[PDB]
Design a protein around this ligand. Structure first.
Ligand SMILES: Nc1ncnc2c1ncn2[C@@H]1O[C@H](COP(=O)(O)OP(=O)(O)NP(=O)(O)O)[C@@H](O)[C@H]1O
Ligand SMILES: [Mn+2]
Ligand SMILES: [Zn+2]
Length: 346
RNA sequence: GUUAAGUCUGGUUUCCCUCCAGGGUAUCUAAGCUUUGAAAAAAA
């Protein structure tokens, strides 16, 4: 984490002017000792083994195949014993004097109430506070979150109005504006932080990461690819029927075989059809063109296996899911009829 | 023996409906529209 935050500092210093990175540099300079601690904690347990119970005098003994599972169960039991206590990473930080006095650095709205919470964690105090809107062009300069009129767009693109970021939230959003810094944390003590930040500080590879508005319009995109221009007459000059720029390539395999067909996929539909001003317009264009109106709904899909732990620990519960259970393995003889029926034929 | 004269009566009673069938079958809602547009983060 130290390496990656120092690399973020370096890269933000390099793009000191390229927008949203002046601010990343400014915050990494302001709150440095906060970011010294990683937003993720780890539990680490350790069981050992001796020559005893595995060797008799100089060769094996009986029950020697019975220690590896024994030690592994020791490890799993110590892990699940620890699991009884949950410590949040935010509890690592020394935020007492920062919040007891107004010595908390706040860019944007100086909070009237000492400090505000971040809208992305809800738990930590914010360091960057962008207004919702009253003018949205000088009110983000009169607050000093930006110094010039050119970085207004540069920041308003990455940090939305009304948003309040914590140090960690901003570090993440920065790593997201440029996802290749993680190579520092990825190559694993093989290069130097400076070598890699200098390797990727030359090339300008605009990585793209979809939003929820992107997904809620997939089949819209897919449609426009076929009905290319027969329904793009009012939208030719709205940069939605424009050209692919240089090399914008993404981890999203669907984005990488529909980007060049003629409809730029790097536009963000929250302004075009998922907007509230340009909405009555795009929908009115699509009525006379008889195409599907996008539905404002995606599907978050999560999958979890069943009983993987005791599967790796040898319990037959993932076989008899529901009938036998984890607790049934405190008196496993009691399910003799239903357990002996299984490994018998296994 | 003779004569002479006919007179009375001119439809009554009972039965006036009984029994079965008193609705059956089909259709029992259909197709649309299932929220939209303004307000998402405000001054002290
Ligand atoms: N022994 C292990 N080896 C590797 N990964 C593990 C091990 N134990 C747990 N994990 C992972 O750490 C997390 C443990 O959470 P969890 O997934 O709830 O445990 P579990 O063993 O899968 N029981 P389950 O609730 O059925 O999933 C998961 O992401 C697991 O993949
Ligand atoms: Mn699991
Ligand atoms: Zn935050």
């Amino acid at each position: 984490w130290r390496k990656l935050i120092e690399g973020l500092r370096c890269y933000s210093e390099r793009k000191r002017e390229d927008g949203f990175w002046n601010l990343v540099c400014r915050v990494l300079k302001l709150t440095e000792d906060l970011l010294q601690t990683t937003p993720l904690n780890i539990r680490v347990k350790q069981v050992s083994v001796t020559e005893d119970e595995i060797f008799n005098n100089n060769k094996l003994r009986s029950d020697s195949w019975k220690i590896y599972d024994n030690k592994y169960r020791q490890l799993v039991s110590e892990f699940k014993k620890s699991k009884l206590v949950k410590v949040t990473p935010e509890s690592r930080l020394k935020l007492f004097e920062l919040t007891k006095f107004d010595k908390l650095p706040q860019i944007g709205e100086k909070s009237k109430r000492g400090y505000e919470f971040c809208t992305s964690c809800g738990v930590l105090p914010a360091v960057v506070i962008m207004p919702k809107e009253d003018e949205l062009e000088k009110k983000l300069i009169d607050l000093g979150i930006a110094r010039d009129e050119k970085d207004v767009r540069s920041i308003k693109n990455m940090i939305s109005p009304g948003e309040r970021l914590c140090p960690w939230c901003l570090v993440k959003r920065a790593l997201g504006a440029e996802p290749r810094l993680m190579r520092i944390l990825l190559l694993g003590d093989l290069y130097s932080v400076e070598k890699i930040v200098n390797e990727i500080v030359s090339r300008d590879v605009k990585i793209e990461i979809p939003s929820t508005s992107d997904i809620a319009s997939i089949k819209t995109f897919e449609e426009m690819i076929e009905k290319k221009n027969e329904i793009c007459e009012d939208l030719k000059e709205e940069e939605v029927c424009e050209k692919p720029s240089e090399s914008v390539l993404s981890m999203w395999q669907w984005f990488n075989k529909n980007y060049y067909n003629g409809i730029n996929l790097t536009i963000d539909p929250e302004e075009y059809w998922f907007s509230e001003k340009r909405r009555r317009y795009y929908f009115s264009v699509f009525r006379r063109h008889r195409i599907t109106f996008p539905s404002p709904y995606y599907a978050l899909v999560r999958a979890d296996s069943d009983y993987l732990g005791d599967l790796l620990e040898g319990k037959l519960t993932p076989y008899l899911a529901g009938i036998i259970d984890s607790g049934d393995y405190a008196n496993i003889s009691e399910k003799k009829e239903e357990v002996n029926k299984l490994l018998e034929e296994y």
